[PDB]
Design an enzyme around this catalytic site. Structure first.
Site, mmCIF file in Angstrom:
data_model
loop_
_atom_site.group_PDB
_atom_site.id
_atom_site.type_symbol
_atom_site.label_atom_id
_atom_site.label_comp_id
_atom_site.label_asym_id
_atom_site.label_seq_id
_atom_site.Cartn_x
_atom_site.Cartn_y
_atom_site.Cartn_z
ATOM 1 N N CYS A 1 1.508 8.214 10.739
ATOM 2 C CA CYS A 1 2.728 8.860 10.308
ATOM 3 C C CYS A 1 2.894 8.750 8.801
ATOM 4 C CB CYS A 1 3.986 8.282 10.963
ATOM 5 S SG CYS A 1 5.403 9.316 10.875
ATOM 6 N N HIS B 1 -8.043 3.872 19.018
ATOM 7 C CA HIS B 1 -8.757 4.886 18.260
ATOM 8 C C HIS B 1 -8.858 4.451 16.805
ATOM 9 C CE1 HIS B 1 -8.779 8.009 21.450
ATOM 10 N NE2 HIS B 1 -7.634 7.450 21.800
ATOM 11 N N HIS B 2 -9.863 4.984 16.117
ATOM 12 C CA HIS B 2 -10.081 4.682 14.710
ATOM 13 C C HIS B 2 -9.293 5.666 13.855
ATOM 14 C CE1 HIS B 2 -12.330 3.117 11.208
ATOM 15 N NE2 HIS B 2 -12.255 4.362 10.773
ATOM 16 N N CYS B 3 -8.592 5.145 12.853
ATOM 17 C CA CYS B 3 -7.781 5.949 11.948
ATOM 18 C C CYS B 3 -8.453 5.987 10.583
ATOM 19 C CB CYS B 3 -6.363 5.389 11.833
ATOM 20 S SG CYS B 3 -5.278 6.348 10.754
ATOM 21 N N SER B 4 -8.719 7.198 10.087
ATOM 22 C CA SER B 4 -9.347 7.337 8.778
ATOM 23 C C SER B 4 -8.419 6.893 7.655
ATOM 24 C CB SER B 4 -9.788 8.784 8.560
ATOM 25 O OG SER B 4 -10.836 9.136 9.446
ATOM 26 N N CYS C 1 0.306 3.554 10.647
ATOM 27 C CA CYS C 1 -0.048 3.990 11.988
ATOM 28 C C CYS C 1 1.046 3.598 12.971
ATOM 29 C CB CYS C 1 -1.380 3.377 12.423
ATOM 30 S SG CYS C 1 -2.810 4.461 12.229
HETATM 31 ZN ZN LIG Z 1 -12.789 1.797 13.884
HETATM 32 ZN ZN LIG Z 2 -3.331 5.308 10.214
#
Ligand SMILES: [Zn+2]
Ligand SMILES: [Zn+2]
Ligand SMILES: CCCCCCCC/C=C\CCCCCCCC(=O)OC[C@@H](O)CO
Ligand SMILES: CCCCCCCC/C=C\CCCCCCCC(=O)OC[C@@H](O)CO
Ligand SMILES: C[C@H](O)CC[C@H](C)O
Ligand SMILES: C[C@H](O)CC[C@H](C)O
Ligand SMILES: C[C@H](O)CC[C@H](C)O
Ligand SMILES: C[C@H](O)CC[C@H](C)O
Ligand SMILES: C[C@H](O)CC[C@H](C)O
Ligand SMILES: C[C@H](O)CC[C@H](C)O
Ligand SMILES: [Zn+2]
Ligand SMILES: [Zn+2]
Lengths: 290, 290
Positions: B150, B134-137, B156
């Site tokens: 976290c 998944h992509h994390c902003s 992440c």
């Molecule tokens: Zn991404």
């Molecule tokens: Zn992250």
């Protein structure tokens, strides 16, 4: 003859007298004479209360494992007199199994012998249910038989298996609690910070005996925790049961979470109590396939 | 500019660091040196100091690895080729766009789609999202087997550090429990006025409560993640189940309890308790139940 009672009760009384001694040693020799004598009465009350909770759970679980009568096959698994007469008179080995098939068709059995023959007990004169085996010591067929435990002078099967596991667990906690609390006072006696010769003997043995049982029962407890997770009895762990599609070491397995529920049940309030809560009836068990 | 936002991410980490640094000073100096060793208990001082440093090192080691282990991102194979990338940007029909992705996804080991049966694609990263990624902003990247971002580790928690994250929790439980259990007797003695030092009285008071507060806090987190690992579900998957070719499945990546733990911790038992990478696979493809 003298039968089992004369000698079979010997391991039970040995454990009983060791446990009775441990009560006297921990409560009187340690808590009253050693700890309370050292002017630390707060620790005495906490230890005595905590000790009795572990002591009760152990003796309660131990009692249930000993005196819970092992389950036996129901009426449907005994051969009828009509079928028994023809089975006993039949000489051909091939013909004998054919009579069994007619009666076996009514009951839900999914396993056979290692020779793909319907499991039958000669001495008991009945068709063995799934996972059930004949015990010469108990002189009966035991539903979901695990093994004959001399320590409880009884068969460990479908009726008492959860009581047997809790008997172990509470032995682990009882011995661990003793060793942890006795350690500081065991050390002080032999660094000569404490002197009482009467308590010195009991405190030393309290630590060694409890540590000897802890190591002994821990491996046994870890082994059965694996068996329950795999849904295998002690017998099945050595000789896997033979199903219609062949021998399967995971024939009765339903997944780790589901296998524990078979033994301990679905209600959490019974998991740690030696009260009967196992699923099923011991004559038929869910299968991995169908 | 962003110097206020980037620095603020380190605030939860530095708060933990200062609590841990204080707890070292309080336990080692105020408790072991000034209280226990001052109480003529020189045997207990050495035992406590040795045991404390083993728990302290494992905690700080696991905590360090979770913070500074960079999260893994998809490999080159999941990026669309320059020929395919150019046509994907130019395509106007939504159905035509999926045709480019579907053709490329056939080459890649992808077994899941979005809730709309669409090939998972990342616009910002310009790549085909691997399974469970998944992509994390906050990280501004796609995270392999992402669990969550976290604040406590300012990083992440995904395929790269998940085992370091679990060991960071585990050793927090053991560190706090060891402190609370050993400080308790001296906490009690201060307030029954068996000990007098006002400087150590303050630190011993907070030593017990702070360790008990964090223990209760992280225990629920640890029990929750132990369930996730047993079910082979990330934190994200526990809310939005992944959709496979046969539909949404909350157990699509489950392989059985024993194997699901092995996916995170590996097959070598000697690495289970060490914050050294030992997880199976590469994070881009995962074994499926079906
Ligand atoms: Zn991404
Ligand atoms: Zn992250
Ligand atoms: C502080 C004292 C409290 C102690 C209570 C603990 C009770 C533990 C009960 C039993 C532990 C036994 C350890 C397991 C020992 C198994 C060996 C055995 O008995 O052989 C049986 C076979 O040869 C039969 O065919
Ligand atoms: C005496 C030594 C102290 C040991 C410290 C142990 C370190 C434990 C680390 C973290 C504990 C947090 C437990 C509580 C976790 C809170 C849940 C959460 O998701 O927080 C994030 C949100 O608040 C958004 O910011
Ligand atoms: C008063 C005494 O120090 C407390 C004992 C606890 C259970 O360790
Ligand atoms: C003594 C034991 O801890 C009781 C647990 C049950 C399930 O409440
Ligand atoms: C705390 C200590 O530094 C951990 C060891 C690793 C290999 O660096
Ligand atoms: C450290 C952890 O509790 C053990 C993991 C194994 C694979 O079960
Ligand atoms: C601190 C802990 O005892 C280390 C165990 C690993 C698996 O070697
Ligand atoms: C299991 C994993 O491969 C361990 C890697 C380190 C370098 O030994
Ligand atoms: Zn029999
Ligand atoms: Zn028996």
């Amino acid at each position: 003859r003298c039968c089992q009672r004369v000698v079979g009760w010997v391991p039970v009384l040995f454990i009983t007298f060791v446990v009775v001694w441990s009560y006297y040693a921990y409560v009187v020799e340690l808590c009253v004479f050693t700890i309370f004598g050292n002017e630390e009465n707060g620790k005495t009350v906490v230890y005595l209360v905590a000790f009795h909770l572990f002591f009760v759970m152990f003796v309660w679980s131990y009692w249930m494992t000993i005196f819970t009568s092992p389950a036996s096959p129901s009426k449907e698994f005994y051969l009828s007199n009509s079928e028994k007469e023809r089975y006993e008179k039949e000489f051909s080995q091939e013909r004998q199994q054919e009579i069994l098939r007619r009666a076996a068709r009514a009951l839900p059995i999914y396993t056979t012998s290692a020779s793909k023959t319907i499991r039958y007990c000669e001495k008991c004169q009945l068709i063995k249910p799934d996972r059930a085996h004949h015990c010469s010591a108990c002189d009966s067929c035991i539903l979901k038989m695990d093994h004959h435990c001399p320590w409880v002078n009884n068969c460990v099967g479908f009726s008492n298996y959860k009581f047997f596991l809790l008997f172990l667990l509470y032995s682990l906690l009882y011995c661990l609690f003793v060793a942890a609390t006795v350690l500081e006072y065991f050390i002080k006696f032999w660094t000569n910070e404490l002197t009482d010769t009467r308590a010195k003997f009991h405190v030393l043995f309290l630590f060694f005996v409890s540590a000897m049982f802890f190591i002994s029962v821990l491996s046994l407890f870890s082994y059965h925790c694996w068996l329950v997770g795999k849904n295998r009895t002690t017998i099945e762990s050595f000789r896997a049961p033979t199903f219609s599609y062949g021998p399967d070491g995971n024939g009765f397995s339903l997944g780790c979470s589901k296998n524990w529920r078979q033994v301990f049940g679905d209600e959490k309030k019974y998991w740690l109590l030696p009260i009967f809560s196992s699923l099923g009836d011991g004559c038929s068990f869910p299968t991995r396939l169908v």
